[PDB]
Design a protein around this ligand. Sequence first.
Ligand SMILES: Cn1ncc2ccc(CN3C[C@H](C(N)=O)CCC3=O)cc21
Ligand SMILES: [Zn+2]
Length: 139
Amino acid sequence: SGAIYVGNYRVVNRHLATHNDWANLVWEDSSRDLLVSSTTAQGCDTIARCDCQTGVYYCSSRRKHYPVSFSKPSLIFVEASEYYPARYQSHLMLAVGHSEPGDCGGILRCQHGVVGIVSTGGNGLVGFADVRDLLWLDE
Ligand SMILES: Cn1ncc2ccc(CN3C[C@H](C(N)=O)CCC3=O)cc21
Ligand SMILES: [Zn+2]
């Protein structure tokens, strides 16, 4: 689990969105595993606006943060789960590192701020849903 709080927005994995997230829906994209809902309180997370390929992510299944190199956001084939059939997930970045399904929502951050959240994995590769292109999160 995990979320990003910026301005009057909450960014979560679409497959983990609650009834309250769907009742206050701003934007969602099944192909990216992202959903953004509105909040009453102001969030103070900083979103990165960059092309970094190195950062640190939080892994809840290890209670640890790991430094990784990661690919640029791209269209990657993702195997079926209980939440989606097999499909291409867009704006996804991979890194060599540990993750389990319950790690979704862990934040990946670079020197400039929040880059994305854990969304996919397996075989020693962790995948992050990028949020750096969502320029509207900041206004
Ligand atoms: C984060 N992670 N680490 C290992 C692993 C193994 C399997 C999965 C399967 N999966 C992928 C889904 C998607 N984004 O298409 C989101 C929900 C989900 O359980 C995720 C995994
Ligand atoms: Zn950066």
